[PDB]
């Protein structure tokens, strides 16, 4: 069974950095792209970025460049995302997702549990 297990909710102050992890179990980690999707509380789904765990390639969206770092630890099959310079507008549910096939990676069939990040004073 393919599963994605993400870390629990976290609370940060403006200007802090938050690290979110997405343990991946059930499949070959180094053959599929992992997409990190940010769900604003009531404003829809922002794609934000993809990581390729084979060589660690990343493609951060042109909005979240400079603030969203993605990394991967293949020895424990876990992906990591870091978001710096948090602002109150960054409160959202951060989702880890994978495509059904390596050839077509946008068909986000497999999703983990949402990680709630709250930014407030």
């Amino acid at each position: 069974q393919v599963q994605l297990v993400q870390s629990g909710a976290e609370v940060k102050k403006p200007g802090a950095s938050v690290k979110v992890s997405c343990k991946a179990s059930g499949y070959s980690f180094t053959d599929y792209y992992i997409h990190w999707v940010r769900q604003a509380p009531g404003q829809g789904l922002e794609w934000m970025g993809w990581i390729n765990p084979r060589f660690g390639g990343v493609n951060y969206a042109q909005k979240f460049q400079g603030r969203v770092t993605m990394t991967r630890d293949t020895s424990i099959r876990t992906a990591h995302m870091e978001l710096s310079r948090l602002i109150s507008d960054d409160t959202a549910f951060y989702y880890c997702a994978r495509g059904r096939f390596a050839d077509s990676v946008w068909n986000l069939l497999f999703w983990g549990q949402g990680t709630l990040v709250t930014v407030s004073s």
Binding site: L45, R100, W106, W111
Partner: protein, 100 residues
């Protein structure tokens, strides 16, 4: 930039009525649109992998079709279990969502 335009923003329907949701891409030239049923508190679920092809584990009551910059998603009779926000997606671009 490929802006997704999704309508209606709010759809009022009872059990058994036919539900029609539209999504208008800014640029298409490819039948690559996905539809996501998001239940409150849960991560979205993929129903229509590709513009028309259906996803395993989804009953036949869900369907859709289209091409280019104009796609249509339908439900052949709304069920009590089908209350969700439906989103369209093309590549990294997500729509605004339709609350059903």
């Amino acid at each position: 930039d490929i802006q997704m335009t999704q309508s209606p923003s709010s759809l009022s329907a009872s059990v058994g009525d036919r539900v029609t949701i539209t999504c208008q891409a800014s640029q298409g030239i490819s039948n690559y649109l996905n539809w996501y049923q998001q239940k409150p508190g849960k991560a979205p679920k993929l129903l229509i992998y590709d513009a028309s092809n259906l996803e395993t584990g989804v009953p036949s009551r869900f369907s859709g079709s289209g091409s280019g910059t104009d796609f249509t998603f339908t439900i052949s009779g709304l069920q009590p279990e089908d209350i969700a926000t439906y989103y369209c997606q093309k590549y990294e671009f997500f729509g605004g969502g339709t609350k059903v």
